[PDB]
Amino acid sequence: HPGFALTAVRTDTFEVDMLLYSGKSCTSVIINNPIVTKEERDISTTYHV
């Protein structure tokens, strides 16, 4: 035995589930209509919303 009494620390990660409670209309969300944007190339065209 050397002249030490070193202490160890280690952390664990758990896979766990959650349950979440809220009241009626805690936060109000305001949104606009989806907006379409376009990009063109010869092989394929693409869209973003």
């Binding site: 009626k24 805690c26 109000s28 969300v29 305001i30 949104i31 606009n32 065209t45």
Partner: protein, 98 residues
């Protein structure tokens, strides 16, 4: 013969925001000019009840409180893409064959 019995597709379980119970926690409003605004703020004004007290103890006082709250930001996006051949067949029909 190999006898393909059937070609099976998928029908998605459709979900809409107002259909879910999570909407009960929410309050959903549309605002067509939304992208223009910088921030949305709300103001609160509160005054407190006070209790009269007997001599010997210092008396309570009036108070006034103002509180301000601010709006969040969280845009979302989704891409979908198509190959030019599908566009060509959507637009152009040629030789009329089946």
């Amino acid at each position: 013969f190999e006898a393909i019995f059937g070609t099976f597709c998928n029908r998605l379980e459709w979900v809409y925001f107002l259909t879910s119970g999570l909407a009960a926690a929410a309050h959903a409003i549309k605002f067509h000019d939304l992208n223009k605004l910088t921030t949305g703020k709300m103001l609160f004004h509160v005054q407190v009840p006070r209790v009269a007290s007997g001599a010997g103890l210092p008396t309570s006082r009036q108070t006034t409180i103002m509180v301000t709250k601010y709006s969040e930001k969280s845009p979302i996006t989704i891409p979908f893409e198509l190959s030019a051949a599908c566009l060509t067949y959507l637009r152009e029909t040629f030789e009329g064959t089946i």
